[PDB]
Symmetry: C6
Subunit: 226 residues, 6 copies
Amino acid sequence: HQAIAKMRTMIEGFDDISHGGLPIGRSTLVSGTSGTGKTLFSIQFLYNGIIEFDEPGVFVTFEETPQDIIKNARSFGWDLAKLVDEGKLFILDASPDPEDLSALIERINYAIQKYRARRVSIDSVTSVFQQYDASSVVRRELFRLVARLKQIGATTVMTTERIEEYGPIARYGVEEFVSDNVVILRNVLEGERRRRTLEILKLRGTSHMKGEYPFTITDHGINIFP
Amino acid sequence: HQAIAKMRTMIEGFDDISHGGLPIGRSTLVSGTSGTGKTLFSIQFLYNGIIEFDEPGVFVTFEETPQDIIKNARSFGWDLAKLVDEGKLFILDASPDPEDLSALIERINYAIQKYRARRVSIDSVTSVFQQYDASSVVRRELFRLVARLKQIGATTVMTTERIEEYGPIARYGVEEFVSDNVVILRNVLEGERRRRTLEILKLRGTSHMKGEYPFTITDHGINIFP
Amino acid sequence: HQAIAKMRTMIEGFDDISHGGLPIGRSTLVSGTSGTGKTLFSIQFLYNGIIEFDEPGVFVTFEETPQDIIKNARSFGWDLAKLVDEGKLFILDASPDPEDLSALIERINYAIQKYRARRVSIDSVTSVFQQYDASSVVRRELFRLVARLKQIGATTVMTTERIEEYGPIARYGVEEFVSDNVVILRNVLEGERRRRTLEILKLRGTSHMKGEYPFTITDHGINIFP
Amino acid sequence: HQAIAKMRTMIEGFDDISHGGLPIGRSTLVSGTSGTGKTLFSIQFLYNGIIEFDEPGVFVTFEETPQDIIKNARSFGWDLAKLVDEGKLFILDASPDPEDLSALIERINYAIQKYRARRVSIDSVTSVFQQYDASSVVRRELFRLVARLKQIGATTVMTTERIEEYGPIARYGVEEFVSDNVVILRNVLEGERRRRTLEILKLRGTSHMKGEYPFTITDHGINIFP
Amino acid sequence: HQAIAKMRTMIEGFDDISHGGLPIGRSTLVSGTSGTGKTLFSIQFLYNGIIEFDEPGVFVTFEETPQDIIKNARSFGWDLAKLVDEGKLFILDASPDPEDLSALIERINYAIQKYRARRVSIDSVTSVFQQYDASSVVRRELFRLVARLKQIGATTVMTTERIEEYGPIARYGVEEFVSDNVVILRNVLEGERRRRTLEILKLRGTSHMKGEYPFTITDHGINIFP
Amino acid sequence: HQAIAKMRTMIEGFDDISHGGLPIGRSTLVSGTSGTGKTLFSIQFLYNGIIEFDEPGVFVTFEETPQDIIKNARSFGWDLAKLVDEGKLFILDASPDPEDLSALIERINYAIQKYRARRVSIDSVTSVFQQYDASSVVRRELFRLVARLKQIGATTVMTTERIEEYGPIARYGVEEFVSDNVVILRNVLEGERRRRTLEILKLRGTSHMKGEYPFTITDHGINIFP
Ligand SMILES: Nc1ncnc2c1ncn2[C@@H]1O[C@H](COP(=O)(O)OP(=O)(O)OP(=O)(O)O)[C@@H](O)[C@H]1O
Ligand SMILES: Nc1ncnc2c1ncn2[C@@H]1O[C@H](COP(=O)(O)OP(=O)(O)OP(=O)(O)O)[C@@H](O)[C@H]1O
Ligand SMILES: Nc1ncnc2c1ncn2[C@@H]1O[C@H](COP(=O)(O)OP(=O)(O)OP(=O)(O)O)[C@@H](O)[C@H]1O
Ligand SMILES: Nc1ncnc2c1ncn2[C@@H]1O[C@H](COP(=O)(O)OP(=O)(O)OP(=O)(O)O)[C@@H](O)[C@H]1O
Ligand SMILES: Nc1ncnc2c1ncn2[C@@H]1O[C@H](COP(=O)(O)OP(=O)(O)OP(=O)(O)O)[C@@H](O)[C@H]1O
Ligand SMILES: Nc1ncnc2c1ncn2[C@@H]1O[C@H](COP(=O)(O)OP(=O)(O)OP(=O)(O)O)[C@@H](O)[C@H]1O
Ligand SMILES: [Mg+2]
Ligand SMILES: [Mg+2]
Ligand SMILES: [Mg+2]
Ligand SMILES: [Mg+2]
Ligand SMILES: [Mg+2]
Ligand SMILES: [Mg+2]
C-alpha cells in the first residue's frame, strides 16, 4: 500500500512517464553523451521547482563558470541572475583555478543549511572521479557521496557523461548500480538524422514507464511526449 | 532414481520452469544488469519462504541500508519491519561506513545459528570482490564462500551484476563456473521497448526448462509465464 | 593402412561421429561454456567404460567435492558410490582447502598404478592454470601434463571452460593447439531458445565427421544424433 | 528573449545550419578523420572573416610550417602571404625543431594584444596532448586552454583528429565534453565511394540544425548545402 | 622475362593455383587455426618431394614427438619410419623436456649439411616465439631465421597458428610481412557445417591465383580443386 | 590560380585519378595490408621515373636484401641491376645484420647528393618505428623524417603496413595525419574472391578523385582503371 513519496519536477511530460517524478530524498543519476541535454535537464528541474513550489535549490558545477550557466539559462528565457541575487538559488563553484571529497560535501551541506534548499543538481561528478583511475575508488566515492546526500535529505540529480550511445551507462560502468536511480539520455544517429530519446531503466521502490520516449529541446525547455 | 531435493520458492511460475525450484543447500547465482530485478527476486524469495513455509531467512546487503530495503518492500505491500521485529527475518549490515571475508562468513554463520534460518540471500558480493582486481582471487574467494555456505546448509541466492545484456554472466567471467547454479536476468532493448526475460542456463544435478521466459514486475511481485 | 587404435566411449551416437571414439592413449580436450555438459560428458565416459569394458577409471576434480559428484551422478541413476567403494572407480581430491603440478601428476600416476585404471577424466585444469597469468606458462604446463599422460598411457578427457560461444576454444586461446584432440560443446541462443550442439574440430591422425551435431541431455545420459 | 551573440563565419551554407554561425567568444571544437577538411575549415573561417569583417586573426599550427599553409591557401586562390606581410593575419609557429602550455598561451595572448585579433584557429592541440597519456591530464589541460581563451575573448576554432568515422569525437573521448561546442566532420565510405558530411551535435546556449549535411570541397572553398 | 624458379610440391591441385608451386629457396609461411591441416600440409610436401624428386627433407618439430608424427603419417599410408631409417628423411627434436635460436639454426644447418637435404618444414615457430612477449622481438627473430634459411638455400615451409578465422594472419600480426610468402588455411563454420578453404595472399616476385579454393582432406592426402 | 606543381609517376591510370600524380617535394604515404602491392608500387614509381624522365632515384629498404629486390623486379621484366651498375639507381641497405634515425637520414642525404637523385622510396619505416612502442615517439620521428625529406627536396613515397583492411591507415593510427599525403591500398575478401582497390583519401593543397578504383597487377606493372 504505502509507497515512496515523489516530488513533481514540472518537466513537460516527464512526470507522466516517471509516475510522479523523482523520489523525494534519493539521488538520481542522469547519463548521456555530449549534446543530449543533461545540464539543461538539471537546470530546468531546479528552475521549475523554484518557480512552482518555491523550493530553493543548489546547483553544483565543476566545468562551467556560473556566468556561463546564467547566460545559457537566459538563452531559454530563464533569469537565474535574479534568483541568485534574491538568494532563492545558489550556484556552487568548484572548478579548478586555471592559474578532497570531504570539503566538497561539507560545502554543499553548508549551502543547504544556509539557503534552506531541498533540491540539488550536479553538473558532473565524473570530473572529480577522473582523479582516481581505479573503478573501486570510483564506486567507493560515489557511494559515500550518495549516502551523504541521503543523510542530508536533498533531492539530488547527479549527471555523468557516457562515451557510447549503446553500452555502459557511465564511463566506468560502476555508476549504474551505486546510484539509487538512473536515467539514460540518448542522442543516436539513424539515416543521417539525430533523434533524441529519453528512457528510465530503474526507479528503486516504485513503478515507472519503460522504453525510449522521444523528447525535443525547444526554446522554452524540454518537451517530452509520454 | 534418486534426485536432489528441492524447495519451492513460491514465485509465480518460476517453480514450473525450474522443475521444483532451487535445490536445497546449494548456492544459486542470479546475474542481471541494472534494473532487471535481482534484489527484488531475492527479497521475494525470502518473503515468500517466510510467509508460506515459516522458514526464517537472513538477507545480507552491502550497498543498501536496511531502511531502504524495508521501504522498497513496503512499496510492494511486504511488511518486512514486522518480520524483523518479531525475529523471523534478519537483515545483516555490511556496508562501508560513509564517515576480511572470514569476519563476514563468521557473522552470517552466527546469524544462522541465532535465528535458526535456512534461507540466505546476498544483495551483491561483487562489492566485496571489487577489492581484489585479479580474477584468480575472485574465483578463490567465491569458491570459499560457496563452500562455507554449503557446509552451513542454508539455501543461498547470491546476486551479482553484469555489464552487457549478452555476453559474460558476470563482471569478471569466472562467477559463472564456480557457483553451483546460475540464473540470468536480461533487460534487453528492441524497437525502443524494453522486454524482460528470465532464463536458467544450468542447474547441476537436476533438470530444468531452457530458454528465455518473459517475466513482468507487478505491484504484488514477479509474475513469470512458464 | 594402419591407423590409430580407438576405444569406444559408449556414448549414444558419439562413436558414429567420431569414427570409433576417442583414440587410445591420447589426451582429448573438451571445451564448452557453462551449462554445456562437459563434466557430465566426462562422467558418462568414465561410467560407460566401467560398466561395459570393466576398465577402471580415475576422475580428477578441482572445484567440486566428491560428494557433489556422487549426488549429481545419482541424479541420472548412476551409483558411483558403489563403484568407489568396490575400488573400481577412484575420485581424486585436489580442491583448495576453504579453511605444484609435479605433485598432482605424481598423485595421478600413483592412483593409476594402484587401481590399474586406463581411463582418466579431469574436471578443469583451468583452475590450476589460473595461478599463472602468462599464456606461455599455460602452454608449457599443459604440454607437460599432456606428455606425462601420454607416457602413462591412460586415455584422458581434459575439460576446460570457454567464455564466448563463438571464438576461442579456451579462455587463453593456446589450449586448442597443445592438446592432441579438441571437442567443442556449444550452448547457443537463437530466437529466445537454447539449442545444444556438439562438434569435433580435429582428431589428429584419424578421420572424423565435421560440423555441429545436436545433442540432448536426458535423464539417462547424453543422447547425440549422428 | 536574450540570446548568445553570434559572428558569421561567411562559409557557404554553414551559417544557415548553425543559425548565425559560431558564438562570439566561445571555443569551438572541430573533429574529423584525416582528409575531412578541418584545417581547410579553420583557414577558410579566418580568411573569410579577414576579408569580410576586416577582423584580424591568429592561426596557431603545430605540425605544418607556415610556408606549407601559405602554399595550400594559394592553391585555393587565397593570398595569405599578402595578409601576413600587411600584419592583418599572423601565423604562430610552435612545431618541434627537427634538429609547457603556459608559454604557448602566453604567446597567443601576446599575439592577440599585438595584432588586435578577435579570431583564433588551432591546427591541432592533439599534438600537444600526446605528451600526456592520461585522459585526466588531457581534460585538465584542455579545460585550462579553453578557460584562458574565454578570458582573452577571442573566438577559437580548435581542431582535433579522430580515429574512427563513427564513435568517439576525439582520440581520447574527453574532448567532446570540455569544449564549449563540437562540430563533427565525417568522411565515410559507402559502396566504394566517399561522401563528405558535416554535422553539429551541440551548441551550448543556442539552437542549431541537427543531422548530417553534405559538403563538397571546391577550388573556392567549402560549399555546404543546408 | 626471367622469373623466380619454382619447385613442384606435388600436392594435388596446389601447383595449378600456385603457378608452379613454392619458389625455390624462399621461406613460405602457412597460417591456419587448429584443425585446418598445417602439419599435414608440411608433411605431405616433404613426403611428396622425397618420393618424386628424391630430394631429402628435414622436418623440425617443437610440440610433437617424432613417434606421434610417424603414427599420424602411417595413418595416411605414409611410411616415414622407413625413410628415417634409410636416412632419406630426418626429423629434428626440439620439444622441451617434460621432466637460444642460435643453437636451433646451427642444428638445422648441421642436419642440412649431413643429410644433403633441400627441403625444410617447421611444425611451429610460435612455440619458440612465445618466450618473448614483445612483437618487436618476434619480428627480429623471425627475420633472422628467414635470412638464415635463405642463406642456407633450403625451401622452408614454416607453419604458425592463428586465433581467428578472419583477421590477423598470425597470433601477433607481424609474421605476415616478414615471411617471403604467406598461405592462409581457413576452417570456417557456416550453417552448422565446416568447409575448408585454401588461399594464397602473396607470392613475392611471381604470379599466383587469388581467392579461396576449397580443399578436402582424404585418406591419401590433401585434394585441392583449382 | 597557382597550384602545387606535380610530377607524373607514369603508372597506368594513376595520374588520371591523382590529377597529375604525386606533388613535387612532398612525402607520400602508401598504406596497405600484406600482398596489396606497396613495394611494387614504389619500385614501379622509381623505375618509370628513371626510364621516362631520366631522373635518378634512391630506394631505401629495411627488410629485403638488394638482391631480392633485383630478382623481384627482373620478374616483371625490369632490369634494375643495369641501372644500379650504371649509377642511375641506388639501393640503400639498412637491414639488421643477421649475425639512430640521424644516421639513416644523413646516409639518405649523402646518397641524394652523390647520385643527384630527385625521387626517394622507402620499403618500410614501420620496421624502424617498432623500436619505440609509444605513439608519441612514432609521431615525433615520422614528423622529423618528413621534415628532413622536405628540406632535402626529394619526392618521397614512404610505404607502411596496416593490420585491418578497414580501419586505421597504419599500425599506430598516427601516421595518417603526420604524412603530407596518404594513399590506401586495400586487398579485401568478398564471396571467396579477392578484389584489389586503390583509393586516395587526401592530397593536401590539390584536388584528387575520391573513392575505390580497382587495380590489377600484371606482368608489366600495375594497371589502374580511372
Ligand atoms: N535555446 C535553445 N533552443 C534549442 N536547443 C537548445 C537551446 N540551448 C541549447 N540547446 C541545445 O542544447 C544542446 C546541448 O546543450 P546542453 O546545455 O544540454 O549541454 P549538455 O549536453 O548537458 O553538455 P555536456 O555533454 O558538455 O555536459 C545542444 O544540442 C542544443 O541543441
Ligand atoms: N512497486 C513496483 N511496481 C513495479 N515495478 C517496480 C516496483 N518497485 C520496483 N519496481 C521495478 O524494480 C526495478 C528495479 O528495482 P530492483 O529493486 O529490482 O533493483 P535491481 O535491479 O535489483 O538493482 P541493482 O542493479 O542496483 O542491484 C525497476 O525497473 C522498477 O520498474
Ligand atoms: N538429470 C538431468 N536431466 C537433464 N538434464 C540434466 C540433468 N542433470 C543435469 N542436467 C543438465 O546439466 C547441465 C549442466 O550440468 P553439468 O554437470 O553438465 O555442468 P557443466 O556444464 O559441466 O558445468 P561447468 O561449466 O560448471 O563445468 C544443466 O544445463 C542441466 O540441464
Ligand atoms: N584546391 C582544392 N580543391 C579541392 N579539394 C582540395 C583542394 N585542396 C585541398 N583539397 C582537399 O583537401 C582534403 C584534405 O586537405 P586539408 O587541408 O583539409 O587536410 P585535413 O583533413 O585538415 O588534414 P589532417 O587530417 O592532416 O589535419 C583532400 O581530401 C583534398 O581533396
Ligand atoms: N586419415 C585421415 N583422413 C582424413 N582426415 C584426416 C586424417 N588424418 C587426419 N585428418 C584430419 O586432420 C585434421 C587435423 O590434423 P592435422 O595433423 O592437420 O593437424 P593441424 O591442424 O596441423 O594441428 P595444429 O593446429 O595442432 O598444429 C583433422 O581435422 C582431421 O580431420
Ligand atoms: N610478375 C607478377 N605478376 C603478377 N603479380 C605479381 C607478380 N610479381 C608479384 N606479384 C604480386 O605481388 C603481390 C605482392 O608482392 P609485392 O612485392 O607487391 O609485396 P608487398 O605487398 O609490397 O609486400 P609486404 O606487405 O611484405 O611489404 C602478390 O600478391 C603477387 O600476386
Ligand atoms: Mg554540463
Ligand atoms: Mg541490489
Ligand atoms: Mg565441472
Ligand atoms: Mg591540419
Ligand atoms: Mg602441428
Ligand atoms: Mg616491402
